[PDB]
Amino acid sequence: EALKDPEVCTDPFRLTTHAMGVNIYKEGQDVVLKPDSEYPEWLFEMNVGPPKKLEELDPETREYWRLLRKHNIWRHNRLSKNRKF
RNA sequence: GCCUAAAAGCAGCCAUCAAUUGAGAAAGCGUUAAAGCUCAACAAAUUCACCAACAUAAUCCCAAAAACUAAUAACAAACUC
Ligand SMILES: [Mg+2]
Ligand SMILES: [Mg+2]
Ligand SMILES: [Mg+2]
Ligand SMILES: [Mg+2]
Numbered sequence: 001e002a003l004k005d006p007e008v009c010t011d012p013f014r015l016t017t018h019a020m021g022v023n024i025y026k027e028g029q030d031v032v033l034k035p036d037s038e039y040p041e042w043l044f045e046m047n048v049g050p051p052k053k054l055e056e057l058d059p060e061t062r063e064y065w066r067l068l069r070k071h072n073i074w075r076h077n078r079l080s081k082n083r084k085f
Numbered sequence: 086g087c088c089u090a091a092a093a094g095c096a097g098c099c100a101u102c103a104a105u106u107g108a109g110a111a112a113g114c115g116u117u118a119a120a121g122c123u124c125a126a127c128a129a130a131u132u133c134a135c136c137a138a139c140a141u142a143a144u145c146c147c148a149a150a151a152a153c154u155a156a157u158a159a160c161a162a163a164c165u166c
Binding site: 051062069072073080081082083084 | 101102106107112124127
């Protein structure tokens with residue numbers, strides 16, 4: 001009762017060559033890495049780092065108000081920490 | 086994600102990102118651990134809503150009573166006329 005024993009057989013090479021965890025069935029057939037001429041641009045056109053900020057988003061789009069609602073929930077949780085019930 | 090017999094939002098430590106118009110890797114109950122009951126977010130309305138209240142002694146309680154007819158009243162000394 002643990003995880004799969006197969007984990008990075010040749011870590012310096014195989015992991016760069018392709019991903020082995022995508023194959024789920026017992027029949028071992030690993031998929032090719034599909035070089036950069038296959039995936040579309042939206043894969044690289046997304047933030048792959050730290051998220052944005054409320055003092056950086058513009059108050060005319062929806063993600064700004066989404067982050068503001070998240071911060072409002074956080075503030076309510078911080079304030080309601082003294083629930084004596 | 087680690088630790089742990091188990092740590093599923095909730096012994097704990099670190100991150101706290103991600104779709105939906107909209108729901109915190111979760112602010113409180115609950116389970117050994119789950120489950121389950123709530124809170125905050127949308128859609129449904131919108132009275133006001135922050136703190137303030139706390140026992141008793143011994144012979145027998147201790148004037149009786151009275152919320153509205155006009156009050157800078159009146160009655161009241163060895164004071165003063
Ligand atoms: Mg959203
Ligand atoms: Mg609610
Ligand atoms: Mg008593
Ligand atoms: Mg007199």
